Ligand binder design. Structure first.
Ligand code: F43
Ligand SMILES: C[C@@H](OP(=O)(O)O)[C@H](NC(=O)CCCCCCS)C(=O)O
Ligand SMILES: C[C@@H](OP(=O)(O)O)[C@H](NC(=O)CCCCCCS)C(=O)O
Ligand SMILES: O=S(=O)(O)CCS
Lengths: 568, 247, 433, 432
């Protein structure tokens, strides 16, 4: 589409043809194959200069060597031009270093908001009170329970004498809200506690959610960021359960510790718990609610763009951006490795509108060839087949490759083959998902893109980029035990996917695309979709890419800081 | 008796790919043994190959059929260290592309450990064996020394805009155009050489476009080589079908 | 050497002069048959698969994949499905593969041939082959297009392999997955009490008998019955698990009408003295008699029987499962205070019971008695002498629990409860089936 | 009815007209015997126990408990210890328990009776009973005071049960612990490549043979060989694993002197055409022949053989293990480009090899070829057709590795390499 193409070219102009800091890139044609390299070093970049100064002073102060760009082999960073990134869909121009997750509070807070969150059913707990104690559960008792719960959950006492408690100023991001597919109950819930499904979602999407979950009621729990940071993901469901248990004891005048309480515990910790993600095997051992356990469908549902946009490509692209950041920068780039990590492996998929350009081109191609199949609808989709995948994925990949070739600036931008592979395959996969409403047809398109890419340029990604991509096409429609899975249910622990950058965010976008093209309310779990339909959370999950930009310009306020108890 | 066909396609790019895979490469320039050893940087020119273990003939081997039937290379027999040569190749019509350097090595040389990446391609092998492979890569059309560079570290350049003199960017400036010829005066990890190595005059952009194994929309477009696109489609279809049911 | 007479759950003699060594999991053919059948068998919920296929609700709590609905009549074709599943599960024609339709076609019992267990390192082949057989059968029978294969697969397998288990799938067995083991040799200890009670058809003593077989098979695989510890564990198995000499039955019967945890202690001490197992060691100034155990492993078996007898009496009186945690604690606590001798497992049944009481009456975890097992962090500690009481307690519950047998173990009871050796394990061990 | 002739590692005919179905882990007595022996057996390092007792160095890297030294002559009493351990490990008098003194008393082979495996859910009884037997034996023999019992126990068991394994203990088997499984049915896949090469006595084809037996036993336990997939996996086991029809041996031999990964592809494609397994489907304008597989599982088996043959040729020429990762990648990649047919496992050997290459040449993890196994996150992906090559590659290495066979698997090779069926698995499966 024309508007996105113009945006892409403007990004290339800003990045390469006007100066950033002191890089002296004061002019140029963005289609030019040649350039002058000025060998200025890191001092051309104002953020790098700031870092060098801090590194020197801290090394001097602490008495052991620290950051020093002259320790780099041969020469310091920036012998060619250090150039900025524009967050896709925005005009936010970023210092490259400001998009490293360590330097970006928005990125860290997005993960904390996911890590510190779980969902716990109320119905089992209420049935327990009714059966074992003969208690009558009403809107009144529920609303009282919820006020008690929102006192207790941040870490405050409701039963015992002589308790110490968390300081409210340190845990102000902690709260519990409820949602319910029972409209009659929703009308009776104190609105301060309610996530209103009928209010937050379109009538069609609300209907899908409510039909999915039935007349069931749920708690969206967000424990303190400061606790999540001190501990881990597996903390979350335990923390929620402890304070749910205390609040039921207090609010319903139970014995503070009787057999019926144990049923509430098992209900909260197991039977009626929905985690963001499940545990991981020994080699990458982690408990629940860590990035590796977060299925691609679940991320697609945490991201809120599907709720606020009718553009199926935009919805998919926001999920790609959120996924590439989380899965590659924080998960694979830190949890599973560390160091400098994988910032630009991810930024390639959410900056400079290159992925967006390829994707929106595909949408126009699909709409033109397949009677508007990429427009929102459930009955205008093309039947998934090898033929349709080959058509769309080949066209997508050829266009994207030609764009990299016609704009040398775009090629230098995405200088790593892996970055280009992620972009080309994400566009091709998202396209195939949009057209078919079949996420695994999207996966097939992803892998075909990789295969065409490899033969086109005689190269693909890094050394071990295409482990999963060569296993890819054959495992898309396999029904063998550890091979078969709908993409919605796949995740970072799907065996082929367990290691490598440049994929997981794309697969999340492919899962989302299959359902955004249909106008679906959710990709795999309505409970998560409603849970994060809440503006009180510090991270705006409706605009994840833009949020990364707000972090880069230091305008994002995170939770969990300790300045209250830190000296002057 | 099977005659290998190597690769599909009927363009200059496909023809060049078959040349690289089959090892039928035109010799374009010369490099002395000592200069090759110098640019590789693993030992002083003319010195004995260091070893990582004793010669096979000294320590002996297990008697199994594979060791008896498969001849050890001269480098294995000598117990050489495994060392390497690594190239970066410009996407602006460098003769070589990473996968096709690796095919070249795998098909034409014994006891090699090729690795393909987007910005670097490497052959690891017993040092003296590696030097044999290195010499062919240095001397023949598979390498243009303006559009490519021998880089064991800090390889950035394959996707960067070319310099106006047609040479691919090197962060560490190991080789450049001097008086119309490519001079390399550092080894592949950028340690300065005692004597600079003349790697010959670069190909014109015109010749590079004719010799290249890379497709580009402004030379020979991938889209235009129908046989290669069909090959991809057939591999994709078959892999997908047989993953469901191998029949 | 030691011999016992084996009596069934109704106090009738089954076999006399049984050497306790013949009761070892490592020697006993009946126990090995129970273990093999437990290893090689899974249940498949055909009704669940059909619903999952139609709704897209597969892969875990809350999951639904929209717009991928498949309307296959799985239940209506249950017999044909069972036939084809058997063909895929079997290894040799006429082998011991067994695939049975249960609940009018709502579920299947899939018993792999022993050969899959013999050729396997553990027991997961029953699940993977069972699920693979069902998946292949549905793919063929209903002509699934390849691009819908992932939906059919996950209707059966759930979120595997993104999850380590078949989360939100439709295949279950009596065991868990090996990676859930806390310790080495713990696989047969990871069986929730509700499962055992379900299989026993809510028969208290057959529930504790089957649990004892599983628990002691675990202790043996843990290497906790080596050397002198073999006699130690087998006296426990014989007396507590298999109603040796009708001691368990008789103690329960004489305390059944009006008895308490306290009066069961009187029975246990009286009988131990009559048998010469304990004697007065020294008398204190008050007149209190400090006893000594003349046979320490036998005394331990006496305490083990008393622990279960007290459970049957106390949980039986209340028809309430929760009484088991305090019963195990206080029977042994009060027994020590009565005699000056160590309680069952030398404190470990009491210790297990302390934490078990806590974690069945608090906010922190656990649950009702039925969710516990020998691999549970709370109830692993005793060497097999605690969990059999929990299974009996659950069997005796008249309906006080939220997480009842039906809640957690309905499929398991339906599919496995009709296996004769499982429902009548004492008769199985005595060879009278 | 698919039959093969089984040839040994030296290309000699062992058995003719063997139904491949008889080679299934689920039917084959020899394979089941190897599995049973693998499950029921552990090695105990007696010299290690003695040193741990004396120094207090037990329970893991860096660990030492000061002031608790026990000076027991474990190795000097190795025979008496072996005898008492057998009495404790055995279930019945005269059963199949086997406890053998190894390396002049420095270690024991403890083979539990099969009854412990029959009565167990998995294989850990070999470790727990073996460790318990040794612990009890030392306690009795040297008259340990009860308050020193914890020291004797941890000399054998290490940090268990604080750790999930016997970390810093002195008991090892061929397998790992069940909790280390990535997937369901993966226990027999968690066998370090160096272990298999050690057991094979650095015989490349016997290493790939034994590895194939373990790997396919895993695939079978995974439920990956059900229905049409049984023939599929068994053709792979027969041809790649067991040198069916001498195809593996002959391809290696005719490429042994001057051959490369590339020339092995010529051998594979020529023979596949000769056998009628593949034929030309279409000829393109350039003259390029697109082939079709007439028997898809058989073509896969051809590619599986070629992958191993290329490993034996390329790793053999270099006498270097590291060449295996690129060999598996490029044999299959180049095979696809030569034929228009999918490589072994329809991309999954190539894919496994891409990540395997990366994780044997980078900072991020993995290591040398010898540390990998079928349960390793990097090398699990192919259905048994990659790891056998890795085991052969490790066997062919002349001394380039830091983490050599001796480094990781010295005890295992010494304790387990003398078991006939293990050292000569092709002959075992053939019935000699
Ligand atoms: C040392 C290795 C070997 C290895 O296992 N990992 C490295 C290095 C590592 C380091 C580099 C940091 C540093 O400079 O100290 C980090 C940041 C991981 C870490 N430890 O934090 C990284 N790679 Ni690498 N690495 C990257 C890339 C790449 C691309 C670069 C090609 C080019 O032409 O420039 C190539 C692979 C390929 O050719 O496809 C590559 C190789 C390599 N990658 C080669 C070094 C190549 C060289 O000598 O220059 N990286 C990329 O293509 C983009 C993402 C980028 C990562 C940083 C980020 O995401 O911001 C970084 C990610
Ligand atoms: C028992 C077990 O709980 P579950 O039964 O698995 O729900 C366990 N909790 C704990 O042991 C919590 C201990 C700290 C709180 C009580 C301290 S006395 C856990 O969450 O893994
Ligand atoms: C392979 C495995 O490493 P090990 O071989 O077990 O040391 C694994 N690493 C990773 O997969 C790291 C992946 C992220 C860094 C590379 C991204 S392409 C891990 O640490 O568990
Ligand atoms: O060079 S490697 O492909 O091994 C690592 C890329 S970050």
């Amino acid at each position: 589409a024309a508007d996105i193409f113009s945006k892409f070219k403007k990004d290339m102009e800003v990045k390469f043809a006007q100066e950033f800091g002191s890089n002296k890139q004061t002019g140029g044609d963005i289609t030019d194959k040649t350039a002058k390299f000025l060998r200025l070093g890191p001092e051309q970049d104002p953020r790098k200069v700031e870092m060098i100064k801090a590194g020197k002073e801290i090394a001097e102060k602490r008495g052991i060597a620290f950051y020093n760009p002259m320790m780099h082999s041969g020469a310091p960073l920036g012998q060619r031009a250090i150039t900025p990134y524009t967050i896709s869909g925005t005009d936010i121009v970023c210092e490259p270093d400001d998009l490293h997750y360590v330097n970006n509070a928005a990125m860290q807070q997005m993960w904390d908001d996911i890590r510190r969150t779980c969902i716990v059913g109320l119905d089992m707990a209420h049935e327990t009170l009714e059966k074992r104690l003969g208690k009558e559960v009403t809107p009144e008792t529920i609303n009282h329970y919820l006020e008690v719960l929102n006192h207790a959950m941040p870490g405050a006492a409701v039963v015992q004498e002589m308790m110490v408690e968390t300081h409210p100023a340190l845990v102000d991001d902690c709260y519990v809200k409820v949602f319910t597919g029972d409209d009659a109950l929703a009308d009776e819930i104190d609105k301060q506690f309610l996530i209103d499904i009928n209010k937050e979602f379109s009538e069609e999407q609300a209907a899908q959610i409510k039909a999915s979950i039935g007349k069931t009621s749920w708690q969206a729990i967000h424990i303190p960021t400061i606790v999540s940071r001190t501990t881990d993901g597996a903390q979350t469901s335990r923390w929620a359960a402890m304070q749910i248990g205390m609040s039921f004891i207090s609010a319903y005048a139970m014995c503070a510790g009787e057999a019926a309480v144990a049923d509430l515990s098992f209900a909260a910790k197991h039977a009626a718990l929905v985690s963001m993600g499940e545990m991981l095997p020994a080699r990458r051992a982690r408990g629940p609610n860590e990035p590796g356990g977060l299925s691609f469908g679940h991320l697609s549902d945490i991201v809120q763009t599907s709720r606020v946009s009718e553009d199926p490509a935009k919805i998919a692209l926001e999920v790609v951006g959120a996924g590439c950041m989380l899965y590659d920068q924080i998960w694979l780039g830190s949890y599973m490795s560390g160091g400098v990590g994988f910032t630009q492996y991810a930024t390639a998929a959410y900056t400079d509108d290159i992925l967006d350009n390829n994707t929106y081109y595909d949408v126009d191609y699909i709409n033109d060839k397949y009677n508007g199949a990429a427009t929102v609808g459930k009955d205008n989709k093309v039947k998934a087949s090898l033929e349709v995948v080959k058509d769309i994925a080949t066209e997508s990949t050829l266009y994207g490759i030609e764009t990299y070739e016609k704009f040398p600036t775009a090629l230098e931008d995405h200088f790593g083959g892996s970055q280009r592979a992620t972009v080309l395959a994400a566009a091709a996969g998202v396209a195939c998902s949009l057209a078919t409403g079949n996420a695994n047809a999207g996966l097939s398109g992803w892998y075909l893109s990789m295969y065409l890419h490899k033969e086109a340029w005689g190269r693909l990604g890094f050394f071990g980029f295409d482990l999963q991509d060569q296993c890819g096409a054959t495992n898309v429609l396999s029904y063998q035990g550890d091979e078969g899975l709908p993409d919605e249910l796949r995740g970072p622990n799907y065996p082929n996917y367990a290691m490598n950058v440049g994929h997981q965010g794309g697969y999340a976008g492919i899962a989302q695309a299959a359902h955004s093209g249909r106008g679906d309310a959710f990709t795999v779990n309505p409970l998560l979709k409603v849970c994060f339909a809440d503006d009180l959370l510090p991270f705006n999950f409706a605009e994840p890419r833009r949020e990364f930009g707000r972090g880069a310009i230091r305008e994002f306020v995170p939770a969990g800081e300790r300045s209250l108890v830190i000296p002057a | 008796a099977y005659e290998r066909q190597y690769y599909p396609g009927a363009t200059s790019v496909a023809a060049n790919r078959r040349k690289h895979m089959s090892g039928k490469l035109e010799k374009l320039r010369e490099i002395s043994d000592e200069d090759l050893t110098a640019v590789l940087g693993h030992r002083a020119p003319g010195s004995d190959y260091p070893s990582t273990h004793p010669p096979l003939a000294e320590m002996g081997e297990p008697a199994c059929s594979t060791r008896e039937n498969v001849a050890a290379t001269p480098g294995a027999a000598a117990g050489d260290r495994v060392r390497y040569i690594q190239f970066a190749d410009s996407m602006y019509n460098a003769p070589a592309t990473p996968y096709f350097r690796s095919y070249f090595a795998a098909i034409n040389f014994r006891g090699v450990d090729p690795g393909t990446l987007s910005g670097r391609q490497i052959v690891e092998a017993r040092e003296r064996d590696m030097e044999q492979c290195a010499k062919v890569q240095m001397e023949t059309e598979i390498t243009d020394h303006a559009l490519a560079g021998v880089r064991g570290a800090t390889v950035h350049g394959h996707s960067v805009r070319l310099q106006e003199d047609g040479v691919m960017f090197d962060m560490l400036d190991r080789r450049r155009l001097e008086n119309g010829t490519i001079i390399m005066d550092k080894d592949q990890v950028a340690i300065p050489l005692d004597r600079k190595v003349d790697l010959g005059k670069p190909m014109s952009s015109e010749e590079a476009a004719k010799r290249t194994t890379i497709y580009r929309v402004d030379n020979v477009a991938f889209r235009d080589d129908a046989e290669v696109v069909e090959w991809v489609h057939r591999i994709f279809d078959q892999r997908t079908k047989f993953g469901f049911q191998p029949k | 050497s030691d011999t016992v007479d084996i009596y069934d759950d109704r106090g009738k003699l089954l076999e006399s002069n049984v050497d306790i060594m013949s009761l070892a999991p490592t020697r006993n053919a009946a126990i090995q048959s129970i273990i093999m059948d437990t290893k090689r068998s899974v249940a498949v919920n055909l009704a669940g698969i059909q619903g999952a296929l139609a709704s897209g609700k597969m892969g875990g709590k809350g999951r639904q994949i929209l717009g991928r609905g498949l309307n296959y009549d799985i239940v209506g074709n249950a017999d044909a499905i069972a036939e084809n599943v058997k063909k895929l599960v079997q290894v040799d024609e006429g082998d011991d593969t067994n695939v049975i339709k249960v609940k009018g076609g709502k579920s299947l019992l899939i018993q792999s041939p022993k050969s899959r267990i013999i050729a396997g390192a553990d027991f997961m082949s029953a699940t993977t082959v069972g699920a693979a057989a069902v998946t292949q059968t549905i793919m063929d029978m209903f002509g699934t297009d390849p691009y819908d294969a992932p939906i059919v697969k996950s209707a059966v397998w759930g979120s595997y392999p993104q999850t380590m288990d078949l989360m939100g799938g439709q295949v279950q067995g009596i065991l868990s997955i090996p990676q859930n083991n806390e310790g080495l040799g713990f696989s047969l200890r990871n069986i929730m009490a509700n499962h055992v009670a379900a299989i026993s058809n809510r028969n208290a003593m057959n529930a504790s008998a089957l649990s004892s077989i599983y628990e002691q098979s675990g202790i043996f695989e843990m290497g906790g019955a080596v050397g002198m510890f073999e006699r130690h564990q087998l006296l426990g198995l014989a007396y507590q698990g298999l109603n040796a000499n009708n001691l368990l039955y008789d103690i329960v019967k004489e305390n059944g009408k009006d008895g308490t945890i306290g009066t069961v202690i009187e029975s246990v001490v009286r009988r131990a003295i009559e048998a010469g197992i304990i004697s007065v060691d020294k008398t204190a100034p008050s007149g209190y008699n400090f006893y000594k155990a003349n046979d320490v492993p036998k005394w331990n078996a006496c305490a083990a029987v008393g622990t279960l007898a007290a459970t049957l009496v106390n949980c039986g009186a209340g028809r309430a499962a929760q009484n088991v945690s305090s019963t195990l604690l206080y029977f042994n606590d009060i027994l020590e205070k009565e005699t000056g001798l160590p309680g069952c497992d030398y404190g470990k049944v009491e210790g297990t019971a302390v934490g078990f009481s806590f974690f069945s009456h608090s906010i922190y975890g656990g649950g009702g008695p039925g969710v516990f097992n020998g691999n549970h962090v709370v109830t692993r500690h005793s060497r097999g002498f605690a969990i059999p009481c929990v299974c009996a307690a659950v069997a005796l519950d008249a309906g006080t629990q939220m997480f009842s047998i039906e809640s957690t173990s309905g499929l398991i009871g339906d599919v496995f409860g009709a296996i004769p050796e499982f429902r009548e394990p004492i008769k199985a061990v005595a060879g009278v089936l």
